[PDB]
């Protein structure tokens, strides 16, 4: 009813975590939007947004998101609070871990969106990332391939943070 969570997914992990986040916020505050069936104008309807996108391409964006990305310039994000989350593999993609959310945030923040939910890089083993802002990632970095045992605690802590930041 108030937070629009727009996600794209390749093997379904970002979708299942979107469902967990929805449940963690509760009181049906978040409405899930699979980007494969969305319009860019759908983003304009919210003041609070959570962007979900995994990184599996070493120089490209997830297909569903790639299509939409080109049209981001069509929406004014000024005044909107935006959070980001994504899946990836820190070991197999050491120099590009979570690049996707970094690319998305850079474009959305340039259009006026205010980033909220910065997440610590501590506890990860990688080299570089376009999501790196130095000290923190622009959003929650999940790794189901190497750190699936840490996912639930990570989601729980990040939502508690987002609850204070989004003013819930």
mmCIF file of C-alpha atoms in Angstrom:
data_model
loop_
_atom_site.group_PDB
_atom_site.id
_atom_site.type_symbol
_atom_site.label_atom_id
_atom_site.label_comp_id
_atom_site.label_asym_id
_atom_site.label_seq_id
_atom_site.Cartn_x
_atom_site.Cartn_y
_atom_site.Cartn_z
ATOM 1 C CA UNK A 1 0.000 0.000 0.000
ATOM 2 C CA UNK A 2 2.958 2.330 0.496
ATOM 3 C CA UNK A 3 6.288 0.735 -0.554
ATOM 4 C CA UNK A 4 6.715 -0.470 -4.124
ATOM 5 C CA UNK A 5 9.241 -3.293 -4.428
ATOM 6 C CA UNK A 6 10.338 -3.676 -8.054
ATOM 7 C CA UNK A 7 12.406 -6.772 -8.768
ATOM 8 C CA UNK A 8 13.887 -8.716 -11.640
ATOM 9 C CA UNK A 9 15.222 -12.251 -11.168
ATOM 10 C CA UNK A 10 17.108 -14.882 -13.126
ATOM 11 C CA UNK A 11 16.918 -18.081 -11.084
ATOM 12 C CA UNK A 12 14.238 -16.829 -8.696
ATOM 13 C CA UNK A 13 16.325 -15.976 -5.616
ATOM 14 C CA UNK A 14 15.677 -12.210 -5.752
ATOM 15 C CA UNK A 15 11.940 -13.009 -5.982
ATOM 16 C CA UNK A 16 11.907 -15.275 -2.938
ATOM 17 C CA UNK A 17 13.826 -12.679 -0.909
ATOM 18 C CA UNK A 18 11.322 -10.022 -2.112
ATOM 19 C CA UNK A 19 8.610 -12.181 -0.600
ATOM 20 C CA UNK A 20 10.546 -12.439 2.674
ATOM 21 C CA UNK A 21 11.058 -8.671 2.832
ATOM 22 C CA UNK A 22 7.341 -8.144 2.177
ATOM 23 C CA UNK A 23 6.544 -10.445 5.097
ATOM 24 C CA UNK A 24 9.140 -8.767 7.362
ATOM 25 C CA UNK A 25 7.611 -5.309 6.785
ATOM 26 C CA UNK A 26 4.191 -6.834 7.436
ATOM 27 C CA UNK A 27 0.782 -5.106 7.634
ATOM 28 C CA UNK A 28 0.936 -5.449 3.854
ATOM 29 C CA UNK A 29 2.905 -2.281 3.424
ATOM 30 C CA UNK A 30 4.880 -3.503 0.417
ATOM 31 C CA UNK A 31 3.533 -4.403 -2.992
ATOM 32 C CA UNK A 32 5.711 -6.630 -5.134
ATOM 33 C CA UNK A 33 6.170 -5.788 -8.794
ATOM 34 C CA UNK A 34 8.011 -8.269 -11.029
ATOM 35 C CA UNK A 35 9.671 -5.962 -13.573
ATOM 36 C CA UNK A 36 9.109 -8.360 -16.469
ATOM 37 C CA UNK A 37 5.478 -7.168 -16.458
ATOM 38 C CA UNK A 38 5.840 -3.561 -15.320
ATOM 39 C CA UNK A 39 5.851 -0.154 -17.015
ATOM 40 C CA UNK A 40 8.438 2.467 -16.008
ATOM 41 C CA UNK A 41 5.600 4.788 -15.054
ATOM 42 C CA UNK A 42 4.617 2.266 -12.359
ATOM 43 C CA UNK A 43 7.606 3.604 -10.335
ATOM 44 C CA UNK A 44 6.081 7.082 -10.122
ATOM 45 C CA UNK A 45 3.212 5.903 -7.967
ATOM 46 C CA UNK A 46 5.329 5.445 -4.886
ATOM 47 C CA UNK A 47 7.198 7.700 -2.484
ATOM 48 C CA UNK A 48 9.049 4.710 -1.038
ATOM 49 C CA UNK A 49 10.752 2.154 -3.268
ATOM 50 C CA UNK A 50 12.901 -0.938 -2.923
ATOM 51 C CA UNK A 51 14.792 -1.978 -6.067
ATOM 52 C CA UNK A 52 15.838 -5.626 -6.401
ATOM 53 C CA UNK A 53 18.277 -6.857 -9.027
ATOM 54 C CA UNK A 54 20.831 -9.686 -9.015
ATOM 55 C CA UNK A 55 24.208 -9.449 -10.725
ATOM 56 C CA UNK A 56 25.081 -12.385 -12.981
ATOM 57 C CA UNK A 57 26.365 -10.448 -15.989
ATOM 58 C CA UNK A 58 29.947 -9.159 -15.913
ATOM 59 C CA UNK A 59 29.094 -6.096 -18.004
ATOM 60 C CA UNK A 60 25.343 -6.004 -18.452
ATOM 61 C CA UNK A 61 22.106 -5.650 -16.475
ATOM 62 C CA UNK A 62 19.505 -8.391 -15.797
ATOM 63 C CA UNK A 63 17.367 -8.566 -19.005
ATOM 64 C CA UNK A 64 14.078 -7.454 -17.429
ATOM 65 C CA UNK A 65 15.815 -4.515 -15.727
ATOM 66 C CA UNK A 66 17.943 -3.718 -18.779
ATOM 67 C CA UNK A 67 14.824 -3.072 -20.835
ATOM 68 C CA UNK A 68 13.390 -0.740 -18.201
ATOM 69 C CA UNK A 69 16.689 1.037 -17.414
ATOM 70 C CA UNK A 70 16.764 2.850 -20.742
ATOM 71 C CA UNK A 71 13.500 4.569 -19.797
ATOM 72 C CA UNK A 72 14.443 5.644 -16.265
ATOM 73 C CA UNK A 73 15.118 9.156 -17.589
ATOM 74 C CA UNK A 74 11.348 9.378 -18.096
ATOM 75 C CA UNK A 75 10.616 9.560 -14.351
ATOM 76 C CA UNK A 76 11.420 12.220 -11.783
ATOM 77 C CA UNK A 77 12.595 10.609 -8.550
ATOM 78 C CA UNK A 78 12.918 13.853 -6.562
ATOM 79 C CA UNK A 79 11.580 13.462 -3.065
ATOM 80 C CA UNK A 80 11.498 9.665 -3.276
ATOM 81 C CA UNK A 81 13.367 7.448 -0.794
ATOM 82 C CA UNK A 82 14.921 4.412 -2.548
ATOM 83 C CA UNK A 83 16.560 1.265 -1.140
ATOM 84 C CA UNK A 84 18.378 -1.502 -3.069
ATOM 85 C CA UNK A 85 19.118 -5.237 -2.718
ATOM 86 C CA UNK A 86 20.610 -7.921 -4.906
ATOM 87 C CA UNK A 87 22.058 -11.403 -5.138
ATOM 88 C CA UNK A 88 25.369 -12.439 -6.642
ATOM 89 C CA UNK A 89 28.486 -14.525 -6.131
ATOM 90 C CA UNK A 90 31.386 -12.662 -4.450
ATOM 91 C CA UNK A 91 33.895 -15.325 -5.416
ATOM 92 C CA UNK A 92 32.985 -15.987 -9.043
ATOM 93 C CA UNK A 93 32.344 -12.295 -9.686
ATOM 94 C CA UNK A 94 35.058 -10.784 -7.437
ATOM 95 C CA UNK A 95 35.542 -7.599 -9.472
ATOM 96 C CA UNK A 96 31.857 -7.144 -10.282
ATOM 97 C CA UNK A 97 30.014 -8.249 -7.142
ATOM 98 C CA UNK A 98 26.592 -6.471 -7.003
ATOM 99 C CA UNK A 99 27.335 -4.160 -9.931
ATOM 100 C CA UNK A 100 23.641 -4.049 -10.900
ATOM 101 C CA UNK A 101 22.280 -2.199 -7.881
ATOM 102 C CA UNK A 102 25.158 0.245 -8.159
ATOM 103 C CA UNK A 103 24.297 1.038 -11.784
ATOM 104 C CA UNK A 104 20.602 1.406 -10.930
ATOM 105 C CA UNK A 105 21.239 3.653 -7.898
ATOM 106 C CA UNK A 106 23.651 5.910 -9.775
ATOM 107 C CA UNK A 107 20.924 6.545 -12.383
ATOM 108 C CA UNK A 108 18.024 6.855 -9.922
ATOM 109 C CA UNK A 109 19.935 9.164 -7.544
ATOM 110 C CA UNK A 110 20.951 11.363 -10.460
ATOM 111 C CA UNK A 111 17.198 11.689 -11.196
ATOM 112 C CA UNK A 112 16.542 12.870 -7.645
ATOM 113 C CA UNK A 113 16.050 9.726 -5.610
ATOM 114 C CA UNK A 114 17.409 9.730 -2.074
ATOM 115 C CA UNK A 115 19.271 6.546 -1.220
ATOM 116 C CA UNK A 116 18.532 4.968 2.110
ATOM 117 C CA UNK A 117 19.647 1.608 3.553
ATOM 118 C CA UNK A 118 23.429 1.742 2.915
ATOM 119 C CA UNK A 119 24.922 -1.608 3.910
ATOM 120 C CA UNK A 120 28.349 -2.408 5.364
ATOM 121 C CA UNK A 121 30.910 -4.189 3.145
ATOM 122 C CA UNK A 122 32.275 -5.989 6.196
ATOM 123 C CA UNK A 123 31.675 -9.745 6.057
ATOM 124 C CA UNK A 124 32.228 -10.071 2.290
ATOM 125 C CA UNK A 125 35.199 -11.280 0.259
ATOM 126 C CA UNK A 126 35.438 -9.577 -3.095
ATOM 127 C CA UNK A 127 37.539 -7.027 -4.961
ATOM 128 C CA UNK A 128 35.469 -4.352 -6.651
ATOM 129 C CA UNK A 129 31.807 -3.352 -7.175
ATOM 130 C CA UNK A 130 29.971 -0.454 -8.816
ATOM 131 C CA UNK A 131 27.712 -0.642 -5.752
ATOM 132 C CA UNK A 132 30.734 0.219 -3.564
ATOM 133 C CA UNK A 133 30.523 3.783 -2.149
ATOM 134 C CA UNK A 134 33.607 3.150 0.017
ATOM 135 C CA UNK A 135 32.965 1.558 3.327
ATOM 136 C CA UNK A 136 29.395 0.617 2.386
ATOM 137 C CA UNK A 137 27.430 -0.925 -0.488
ATOM 138 C CA UNK A 138 24.544 1.157 -1.781
ATOM 139 C CA UNK A 139 22.194 -1.592 -0.531
ATOM 140 C CA UNK A 140 21.820 -5.099 0.919
ATOM 141 C CA UNK A 141 24.215 -7.572 -0.701
ATOM 142 C CA UNK A 142 23.085 -11.175 -0.509
ATOM 143 C CA UNK A 143 25.007 -14.222 -1.648
ATOM 144 C CA UNK A 144 23.065 -17.438 -1.708
ATOM 145 C CA UNK A 145 25.937 -19.319 -3.339
ATOM 146 C CA UNK A 146 28.541 -18.678 -0.660
ATOM 147 C CA UNK A 147 26.655 -17.238 2.294
ATOM 148 C CA UNK A 148 23.123 -18.675 2.298
ATOM 149 C CA UNK A 149 23.387 -19.256 6.047
ATOM 150 C CA UNK A 150 23.637 -15.501 6.616
ATOM 151 C CA UNK A 151 20.714 -14.382 4.444
ATOM 152 C CA UNK A 152 17.950 -14.403 7.057
ATOM 153 C CA UNK A 153 19.895 -12.404 9.666
ATOM 154 C CA UNK A 154 21.018 -10.004 6.983
ATOM 155 C CA UNK A 155 17.456 -9.427 5.733
ATOM 156 C CA UNK A 156 16.162 -8.985 9.288
ATOM 157 C CA UNK A 157 18.818 -6.376 10.197
ATOM 158 C CA UNK A 158 18.390 -4.423 6.963
ATOM 159 C CA UNK A 159 14.582 -4.251 7.232
ATOM 160 C CA UNK A 160 14.915 -3.047 10.858
ATOM 161 C CA UNK A 161 17.168 -0.299 9.459
ATOM 162 C CA UNK A 162 14.754 0.485 6.589
ATOM 163 C CA UNK A 163 11.881 0.646 9.062
ATOM 164 C CA UNK A 164 13.623 3.544 10.855
ATOM 165 C CA UNK A 165 14.752 5.222 7.628
ATOM 166 C CA UNK A 166 11.427 4.933 5.709
ATOM 167 C CA UNK A 167 9.738 6.074 8.896
ATOM 168 C CA UNK A 168 7.762 3.009 9.833
#
